[PDB]
Amino acid sequence: LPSTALAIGYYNSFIKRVCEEIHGSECVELKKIKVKSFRVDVVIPETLDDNGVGNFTTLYNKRYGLSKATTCTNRGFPFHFKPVDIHLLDIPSTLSTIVESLKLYFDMDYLEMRELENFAKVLKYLIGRNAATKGYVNVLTNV
Amino acid sequence: PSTALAIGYYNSFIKRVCEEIHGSECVELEGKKIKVKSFRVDVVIPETLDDNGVGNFTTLYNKRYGLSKATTCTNRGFPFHFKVDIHLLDIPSTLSTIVESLKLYDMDYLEMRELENFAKVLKYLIGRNAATKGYVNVLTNVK
Amino acid sequence: LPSTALAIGYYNSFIKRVCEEIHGSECVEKIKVKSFRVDVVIPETLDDNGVGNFTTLYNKRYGLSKATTCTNRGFPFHFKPVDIHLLDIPSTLSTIVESLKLYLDMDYLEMRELENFAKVLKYLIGRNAATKGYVNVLTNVK
Amino acid sequence: PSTALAIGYYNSFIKRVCEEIHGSECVEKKIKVKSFRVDVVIPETLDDNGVGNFTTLYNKRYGLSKATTCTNGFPFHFKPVDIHLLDIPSTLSTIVESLKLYLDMDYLEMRELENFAKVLKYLIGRNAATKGYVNVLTNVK
Ligand SMILES: Nc1nc2c(ncn2[C@@H]2O[C@@H]3COP(=O)(O)O[C@H]4[C@@H](O)[C@H](n5cnc6c(N)ncnc65)O[C@@H]4COP(=O)(O)O[C@H]3[C@H]2O)c(=O)[nH]1
Ligand SMILES: Nc1nc2c(ncn2[C@@H]2O[C@@H]3COP(=O)(O)O[C@H]4[C@@H](O)[C@H](n5cnc6c(N)ncnc65)O[C@@H]4COP(=O)(O)O[C@H]3[C@H]2O)c(=O)[nH]1
């Protein structure tokens, strides 16, 4: 199904790049900020919307009040985080893509959370793969 | 495999950038608004991919052409490289994911297949919509 | 029937646009907002020549006030640091009567399309997340 | 389904604008009105997301000024002068959404577009207050 490719791409690029860069630098760009310990949480909506996950992302922002910061590059990676420990979290925008694929592929909702749980499984497998993400990371489904 | 990733890339990057440019006609080029009279995004696709991904080709092309990087009008910024009539060019980093999947999944022929499939689906989705049609093109068979 | 198309159009355009815009901006015309709850108001029955008289009567009886969306697509809608209690009567329902005049009971039929419109609105509110509790509908009013 | 949507658009927008312009001859300061006709132009094919993109493209290419009618409003697009009204009916977008929830796809959209245009021009011709002072232009871009 066309959910493993999205999971592979999102994990590899975003997660591996950000994790390696921040482990090699230990700092973020809020003005500059510095970090002490790392926890990245992937947030997965229970079901997708008809027109992407932008509205869900904005609702989550207003509900939790996350804060903006890219990686300290002198390839900016703007992310949302909550001498200091940082509890990073994000809702992968790539999930939006899936809905469009479905239009080119109530069975709709049933299929949708099938690919959502498959995406979560692929992410967990890729966490298991590498060591840079071997406990400094977690995922949350049915949100 | 490449089709869903291609759909996602097209949707997000192309529709967002085209819509913002059309509705604003202003890009923060070194933090200063430029005019917009005629433009089009040239998405250029490598013929072959490296074992490590696409970063090397992106670096080589950008250095050869020295394309300046800037975002779109803000008030999430979508940085892009380009050169008044703006000349937008794009190396889609998403292509890297392809090999990753094939690495987890004649090889070089398979990457060729995925690259050409990406090209065709991009061209089809560009042909459909009116926001992009005319203001975007895909340049395969490049280097 | 020709009530699901009207319901879909009304919901999508008006409700989704306004709700998303106010969630993303939190301001109207100046005034600033803290929370949202939009009440779609549905007449218990339709009239011969639309719902203009019903809308004016409701406005006088509740004394609503004007407000548009902070666009920099003016959306003139009626509302009652400050929590706003929004309500609205969809003018599109007027159109429905003409449809019947070009489709042909009348009272029961109109009640049927009104109920179908309400069901479609509730379904679409259930669909999206931007409108997942920030919206309510009110059928059989007065 | 699309027919009722077209009928509603016609009634509300066209009837109200025609009535106001004929009874006032003043639109947004106040401009005079001597002769006019609103050109409802219908896209040949629709985007997946709706009509906003085509509306923006057409308006920017033609640089159409936007203004409302007299008050004591209804916005619209146009260009001692004869008014030349124009409008992209946003309601067209609804069609695709309905057709997406309803269930060749492009051909179904073509059906809806032709039906919308036909019913629009029919209800324009039928009434007297609108006859002559309005036209629908398909086969656009
Ligand atoms: N919160 C966050 N997520 C990111 C960031 N960078 C990538 N991601 C996520 O990783 C997915 C895949 O990354 P990609 O680089 O391999 O493919 C991306 C990339 O090739 C291109 N793209 C998207 N946003 C871009 C951007 N801002 N700049 C340049 N290219 C961009 O479009 C592809 C798909 O975008 P998507 O937004 O739907 O999913 C992203 C996206 O959800 C990031 O800096 N922050
Ligand atoms: N309170 C409020 N309600 C609105 C507004 N815009 C639309 N609505 C509601 O959503 C229905 C359908 O929205 P639409 O945009 O898809 O189709 C509308 C719209 O596309 C068109 N129209 C009206 N005034 C227009 C205008 N000034 N410019 C362009 N199109 C216009 O007339 C269609 C039918 O109008 P209607 O009033 O009977 O039903 C509205 C109406 O009940 C609005 O700005 N405010």
Numbering used by the authors:
A (entry chain C): 152 to 181, 184 to 227, 234 to 241, 252 to 274, 284 to 321
B (entry chain D): 153 to 227, 234 to 241, 253 to 274, 285 to 322
C (entry chain A): 152 to 180, 185 to 227, 234 to 241, 252 to 275, 285 to 322
D (entry chain B): 153 to 180, 184 to 227, 235 to 241, 252 to 275, 285 to 322
Please quote the paper that reports this structure.
To define the molecular basis of STING filament formation, we reconstituted signalling of the S. faecium TIR–STING (SfSTING) antiphage effector in vitro and used single-particle cryo-EM to determine the structure of the activated complex. In each SfSTING dimer unit, the canonical V-shaped STING CBD is positioned above two TIR enzymatic NADase domains that dock against the base of the receptor.
The partially closed 3′,3′-cGAMP-bound SfSTING conformation allows incomplete oligomerization and is incompatible with stable filamentous packing beyond about 4–6 units (or about 20 nm). Compared to the fully active SfSTING–c-di-GMP filament structure, 3′,3′-cGAMP recognition induces partial closure of the lid domain and an overall conformation of the STING CDN-binding domain (CBD) that probably weakens contact sites observed for c-di-GMP-induced filaments. Additionally, a lack of well-defined density for the TIR domains in the 3′,3′-cGAMP filaments suggests conformational flexibility that may impact stability of the filaments. Our previous results demonstrate that 3′,3′-cGAMP binds with slightly weaker affinity (about 700 nM Kd) and is unable to induce robust TIR NADase activity, findings that are now explained by our cryo-EM analysis.
